RNA sequence: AUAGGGCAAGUCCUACUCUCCUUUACAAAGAGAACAUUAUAUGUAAUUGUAUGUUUGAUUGGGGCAAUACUAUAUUUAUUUAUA
RNA sequence: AUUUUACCAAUUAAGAAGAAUAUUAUAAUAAUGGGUGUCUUAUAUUUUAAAUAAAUAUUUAAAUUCCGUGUAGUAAAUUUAUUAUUUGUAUUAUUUAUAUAAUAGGUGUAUUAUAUUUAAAUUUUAAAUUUGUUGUUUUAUAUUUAGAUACAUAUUUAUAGAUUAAUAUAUUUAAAUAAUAUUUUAAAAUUUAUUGAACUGUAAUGUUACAGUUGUAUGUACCAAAUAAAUAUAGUAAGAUUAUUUUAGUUGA
């Protein structure tokens, strides 16, 4: 048949939908030496408020979505604790509308005091340091401080690069042509694929800096300073790609066989991973306590006894017969000569 | 079971005694903690250097392209390889240099290795066809023998009228459905399959995993396995002098024999292979690769007789490198004579894939310098090969005053003349006026 | 051909003499019992558990002089959706409720007015600009949203609208 | 109803399983016949007469 | 076997057919040979163009070239072999002829 | 099963009955054009393989076949540029498939060839000759390596004389000893002989 | 040139079925694919190994490679446990 | 498909668009005949 | 079966290799009589003469205009069947394209390929294809 | 007493076939007589037997095709054919 | 003084060599019929014949022909050879037994409809057969076990047309050369070879003679007999056919 979904129709239920931990940056990291080198409130009615204002700003009406993000600031600001995620986000948020209205110079001391919240909490947000140092990098470039701008834009990729995994947002989502089992119609689960752009928002946010930071750098003349970012960015670009990266497994239709999602759809590493932690860079850490063989010169490692006997080398053979035995009766002498000492 | 039935989890208590054991069991203190075989990748054999140590200058990491030298270092005399390297399709396109160890387990001098043996990047299908071949070929077809209905030895004739008893009409009750009855159809060694293996597919496989023991770093170049007295306790002084661990549960060694450097053989050295015969895990194999065209003169029921799976009449000796082996061995060890060898018997198969546009440029370049033709002296060769060659040379001389000289055949195939004898319906030969053609029996 | 041999020999001790004795009569009975058992579930258990509902909201309705006809289309028409469970559980367990409601829809108290339209605004049509300032539509939109925001809840941000809608001035730095 | 028509000309359309239960039961009949008649031709014991 | 499809309401219980929209058995065949009808009248809507000899079948293509061969390696003008397995003749008029 | 598809091994047999009837394992109308059939390969048919002027052309660009030599059959077989499946008697006969010119001259010696690729050889100026053999002569070209001595080659059957050995048009082998005329003649020079248009050891003394 | 049937593999020996190939090996008639398989309801002993397909590198007492289970023989001191200790045969209390 | 769907379409319409045919005795739909309009004793109020 | 059954413990049979069958057992000479295939590998057809085939009295059938040589396409059917005919000889191999209805100079010239056969110098390159080979000056047969 | 315990069966009329009988035809035995060649055979074998198998699907028919194209002329015509 | 209602319950850990010079295939070197508790006597203990057979054959062509029942020396005494109780339990793999038994003293009801304890409701075989889809037909006591074969996949050495009836012609694009298989039970069967006259039926005077193209209704308790061998167009008889949680087109042409 054919489904014309006219009416109301539950979305079916796709890996795609996993919910996704945010990176964070480590807990022994400060942001600012980086730089140097509950009460009640409506939150359901103050995110309403804060969707409006995120669509004024998409729709260009910037002075309505600094006064929506105004009281969703105040909001916020209320509710949550100091140094708290969503504060510093929703400062952002002000920071930028107020730089897209006019008010440069409150949009820069915003952002500064973003960039103070994010140094005094711990364990930031990746993805929120990534959009803050964005922003910074915007504002100044409004101000006219070119070279401060591109620096903020250099600074944000070398953060998102020593702190961020390139895999981590397809782990899911690299095995999901191998479901299909359809080839001549439905073959679209085959080819299914899930934009970067859209699954990693900091690779996206990184990306426009680096864009922004190549018109600089194209504005003021400079050539070394563009080649090197958009190379930077070009190779940001290739390690998503290669973490996406994978073969093609059936191609033609598979009849039955249903019970081979299970496989389909694991835990299966990406290629940053599996190098990262190849079985020999990343050695694991065997103790011979909770084992029984172990290397010559290491044998009195192994897992204790009560009161053990070597009785030989477990020759088969042995039950045969007496001349099957006679034949291995030096093999036990021989073998204990060979694991001496 | 399966994962979605209930019976995977059917069972909900019983299954640990809540008491732990005051021996071992710990708890999980937090991330600080490591953890024994803890490990984020799914390793199946959970090893690392201190169980199964690599032999080879680096540990395998993802920045080197293989754990071996990349440069010829010059803090030793190193060697090139016998025959010249050109990069074909597969090959790794990187310089693989490893050292050579002594019996004293001690490096030597360090050699080069064929990008084409040991840098073809390994592929999981060819090495799986490989395996699949070797496992299929290496059961007791003898052994699968069953009974059959016109065997199992009751009276031909039926037991009891259709209807007249009042059981099922049954009539000569051999068949399978009774527990002394046979099959219409059961399996029989004649009806059996022993895959047939293609010299090409054979040599590609066992070159991809050679080239997967040099990435892992198992391999090991020995300059040669000789052993001081054919017993089995020199062998394993050897084995322990060198750091082998031939236990049933160690890792496992294969030995590539051939021969030294200077002197490469065909033949297992005597005293080795005498002593090589030990109860633990340690294998043996011929220094060649490639495999001898399969055939199957039984390719029809033709032999009726033929007590032999159906297939290839000329399965794979034992001895003969394979991938199960070499993945069930953990280490391997290749003397310079099998490292001759195997380059000896592929340089032709290599310069014959290379495609024209470099075959023309190969004789330029001299790598294509026929001793034959004098261009160059006469190369190294094993010593039964050199034994052979000295024996043909020794011969040619006889071979001087008679027409059927190999060496010089139809030496007056110009200066003679054809005739066409239309009364005979022939073609002769004549050299002044001599009838020289034969005229062939029959 | 599969059967659910393994799970139902598990549950065959809930059977009685041979069934119970002999695998075969025993998951021959079990596999026939979980098919009647699905049966009735997905074709007359909820008929018969919204029967047993339907009656006993009756009675209730009849205790107080109403019955489940009148006590229904009036539950409909002044909007008071009581599912016929829950108002089974309220006439059972709180009879004051539910007598509560029988007199609203016995009174003659109007019914909730129908819900309204989207209304626009005079500031939409309002030009702008008229020939640094906000739409007076976006203004009027945002009052709205800030009045919902105070009267979802006792929030401590404060009632003055004014105040906060004036928010973003807190945030501005004067230059 | 016949049960095959494609195939009356060979199992007089009847099932076969029917017709197996019939012959079993006409053919005990008939071999107990047979053997009263055999009996009463060699004199009361067929094999001895 | 009759197919069973997932359910996704007691409507499709209630379902005979899997494609209420879809003309019965012999409402299809009727459509599809009006179609095949239309289509072969729009085909032919022009003469029968008379295809060179290269052009024809495998089974005709072989046999014209045989018969024309020997006007092939002696070029005069006004040369035709009146074959049998050549196209028949249409009996009208075509722009092509 | 042949009416549903593919059925698990668990049950369902009820409706396959011919899943099990292929499991246990017009012409009348039409005259036979002749008593052997069309196409028959009755034995002594000249049924040749094609070899593409094309394919020899690629081979000699590539470099697997020598111009400065006269090709032969047995020099394909060696250069590898035709297989054993394809070498059945007659031969081979070469075609001109989609080549329009040949660069430089080429002499060539197979068993036919068509009119066009003679006269395309013939115009790039190398030559051509139709060496039409019998079975012997065919395995002798290809296994020189037996025969250390010239045997006594016997001439084609009377179809290759007619067709292919004395034949102008294809420069059969035998046209130049069909048009003599002392055979003729006279028993004496009924044999006219021709002649050819006019070490090997592989060990060598070390000099320096 | 075909590659060699992956279930040709000695890896498993199934008991006949209606769907498989002329070179398909399966278990003998009168035969069970799993040994200690003598009901369904069967218990895998524990501790007891029987090899099969191959001569095992290392044979305990308590397994079996080509002999039935005698107390005498599979256990010659029942308070003795064996197991296989830096590839030796080793017996414990 | 194009032309299998037009001609579905176009045999439903004439299948579903006249329901019922004028009597062949009044007019034969066969011989091309057609009965016109008339509206004589007819009412011009919405009734 | 089981061990202790005497009818196992006696032999009665033991069977051999079954013989294989005729490799063009199914190619039948009324096809290759009747038919003709032709056409791409892909789009290849079996034709075979149309025309009235049957036998009338003398003074019949008179104008041969009306009789015309041509050749047309059997019905697909037949030649699906006759395909299907051809194909059984190997069913797993899904790769290996339909035998032909007459035999090529590759399809004859393979079996002397092989390597068997490679060896076998008498019947490599259509021996029997080829006309005899002339006898000997004395021939005599007692 | 009911169910279970094999049963589309009984009579009657029509139709067709089988069994059976017979001979002058068909196939076909075996056997034998006679014949040719010089008490045992070979080669033919029209008699006989008829033991035996058959002996109501006729489209292996009927129709239509009829050298003398093309351009042209003449005669005749059962009232528009016929012939060169 | 007297006395404890009726009914209703359940299978599991196995005591000991009560399982191996074992079961099957596997050895290409022996061999005048193996017969112990045997133990003179040889008119009386003779099996030979130019044939497809205990000797067993590497391909698709052509070809007689009313369904083509089909392929040659590969090396010439050349190693494809009919093997064999131990100088490895011979080796390698494979298969394997139902001897054996305290189990509980009462969760549901007690005027009748059926497991899940709040009382009710639901409930009253399965498989095949039946295509007029059944109320037709057949099978199933239960426990455990035995029980049925269409290769879901082709990595560099590498090279692949057509076409005429035939001669002949050949303007003109591919390719992973691989074969061996094909459910299962069951036909009134027929064929080959052999025995039976102690039953029965004759002739002879209990015994002798005559036997399955057949002796005199019968020929040893199924006369289209009995015994031994065999897998016939098993097809246009029938039955059975081992793998749940599924993921796409038409339901009488
Ligand atoms: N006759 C054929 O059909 C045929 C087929 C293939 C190859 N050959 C080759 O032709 C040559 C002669 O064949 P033929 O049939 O005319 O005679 P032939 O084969 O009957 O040979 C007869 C004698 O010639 C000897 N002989 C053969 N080759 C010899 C050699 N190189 N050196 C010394 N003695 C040799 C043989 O030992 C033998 O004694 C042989 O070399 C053969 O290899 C012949």
Redesign the interface.
Known sequence: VTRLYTSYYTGVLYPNQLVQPKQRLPADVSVSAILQKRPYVPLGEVAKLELQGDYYMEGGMFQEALEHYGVVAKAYNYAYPENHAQRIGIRIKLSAAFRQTGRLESSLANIEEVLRMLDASTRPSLELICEALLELGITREALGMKREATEAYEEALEVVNSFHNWGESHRMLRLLPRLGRRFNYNFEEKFVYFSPFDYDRTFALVDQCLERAETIFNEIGDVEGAIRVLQQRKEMIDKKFFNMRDFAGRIHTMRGHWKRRAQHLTNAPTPDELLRYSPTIHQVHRDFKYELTAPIGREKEVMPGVNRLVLDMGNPYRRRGRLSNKMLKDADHKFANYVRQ | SSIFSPRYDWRTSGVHDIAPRDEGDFLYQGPQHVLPGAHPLPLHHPHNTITRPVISPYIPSPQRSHPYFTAPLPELPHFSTTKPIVYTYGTMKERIIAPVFNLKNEVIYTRELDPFIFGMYPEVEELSKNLTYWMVRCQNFASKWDYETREIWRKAKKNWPNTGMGMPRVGNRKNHLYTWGGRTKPSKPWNMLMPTMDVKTWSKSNRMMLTLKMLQGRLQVVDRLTLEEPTQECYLELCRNMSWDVRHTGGGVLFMDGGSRITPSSEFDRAFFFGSFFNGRNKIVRPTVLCDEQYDYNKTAAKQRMKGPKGAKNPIPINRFNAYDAMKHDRLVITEGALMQLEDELYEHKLQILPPHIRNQLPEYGYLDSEALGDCVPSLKTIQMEAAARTEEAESDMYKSFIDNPYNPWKDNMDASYAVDGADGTVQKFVDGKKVSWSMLS | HYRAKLELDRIRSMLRGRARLERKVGLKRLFFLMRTQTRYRVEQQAHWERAIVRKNVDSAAREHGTGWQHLRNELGRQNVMLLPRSQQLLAQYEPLAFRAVVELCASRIPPPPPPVVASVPEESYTLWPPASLSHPAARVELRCGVERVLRRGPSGLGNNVNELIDAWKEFDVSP | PLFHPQTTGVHGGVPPRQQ?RV??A???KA?CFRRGLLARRKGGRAKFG | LVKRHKITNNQMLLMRRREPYKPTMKDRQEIADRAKLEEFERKNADGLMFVPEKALPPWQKSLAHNAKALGSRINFRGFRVRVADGQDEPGFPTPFR | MIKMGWMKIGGSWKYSRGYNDRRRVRFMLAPRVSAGGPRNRYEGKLVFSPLRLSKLLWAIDTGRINPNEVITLYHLRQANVVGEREIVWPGFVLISNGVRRVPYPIHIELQNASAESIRLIEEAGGSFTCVYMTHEGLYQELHPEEYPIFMDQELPERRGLESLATNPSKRGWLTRWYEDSSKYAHPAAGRRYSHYLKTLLPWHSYNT | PRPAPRFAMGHMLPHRSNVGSQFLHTQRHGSRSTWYKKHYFSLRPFAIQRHHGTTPRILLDRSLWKSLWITKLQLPDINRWERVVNSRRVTED | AAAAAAAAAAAAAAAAAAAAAAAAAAAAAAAAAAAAAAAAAAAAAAA | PKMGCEEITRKARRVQLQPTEYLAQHRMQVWQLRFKEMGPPFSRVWVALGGKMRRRRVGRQVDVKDMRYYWRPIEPQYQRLYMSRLRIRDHSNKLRQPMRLRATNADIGSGSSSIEWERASNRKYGAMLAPPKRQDFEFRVV
């Open positions: 197996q012959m079993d006409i053919t005990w071999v």
